[PDB]
Each structure stands twice: as C-alpha cells, then as structure tokens.
Design a binder for this molecule. Sequence first.
Ligand SMILES: CNc1nc(Cl)nc2c1ncn2CC1CCCCC1
Length: 164
Amino acid sequence: GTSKLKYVLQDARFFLIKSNNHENVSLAKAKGVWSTLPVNEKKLNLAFRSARSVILIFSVRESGKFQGFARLSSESHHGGSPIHWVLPAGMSAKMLGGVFKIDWICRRELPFTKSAHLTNPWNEHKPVKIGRDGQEIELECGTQLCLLFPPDESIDLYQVIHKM
Ligand SMILES: CNc1nc(Cl)nc2c1ncn2CC1CCCCC1
C-alpha cells in the first residue's frame, strides 16, 4: 500500500539531486550514502534539522528519468569510510567530502514523461524534472512526484518511520 509512504512524506521537505553519472547513484543505493557540493551540503544540513523528513529525489544527467528517492537519516559527516565516487570533470574528492546517511524509500526508476503534469513553484513552475542539483521542490509537488514512482516492494518503511 501507500499509507506508510504518505506518512513518511507528511510535512517533508524535498530536494532534487542531479548526478552527472549512474555510478554514484548506484554506489548511493548500495551504501546508503550521498555527498554533494558544499553549497547544497549546507542547505541539506539546515533542512535536516527543520523537518520530520528530508527527501532526496535522484536524477542522473541525460537519463531522462529519476532513479528513486531516499530520506536523510543524518547530517553530513567527515572522516568516515571513504566513498569511491566517480568524480566528474573539474570535480575533486574534497568537494564531495561530507557524507550524509540516507535510507532509500524507492530504488525504482520514474521516466520524466510521467511527471510532465507536475510543476515546481520554487523553480518558476517549470516541470519538476527541471532544476539544478539541490533545487528544493515544494511540498505538494514533491509529494505527488514521490507518489508517482512504482512501489518498491523490497523496502519496509517501518524502520524509516521509527527514525522520525
Ligand atoms: C556523489 N555526488 C555527485 N556525483 C556526481 Cl557524478 N555529480 C554530482 C554529485 N553532486 C552534484 N552533482 C552534479 C554537479 C553539477 C555541477 C558540477 C559538479 C557536479
């Protein structure tokens, strides 16, 4: 069902994560971690303290799709087990240094064609697929976007709920 999902998304905040490659999203799915540039790192740390759930919605550049969504379970932390991110051009490991822990809610894809009816008030009401890495998605748009993803029956939201 979708009832526990709706509960997790209640009063949540939503951010679009744009990854330059599939490898880092796969690593994030395997390890439950994400790192972003310092500007977005600061925003996400602020958001984590402000809301019951902060949801990252992932999209790989040029894929035409979202690859799933996850809930922040921590603020960023430095000095843990290093993450072997594939670094884009001009990108260094220092600027990906803070690691957030995340719990995946959905690891399934959603093509942009299915979200064409959703616009984001915080990005000039452009289609929600449009946005730079870190763009915040307004509550109603973000909730409806997450509800469009195919259910991920491999995930049990019970433990996620027991962290809010
Ligand atoms: C593990 N984190 C990331 N991995 C990858 Cl491949 N791309 C990312 C990541 N965070 C943001 N982006 C997109 C930006 C776009 C501007 C230039 C630098 C990259």
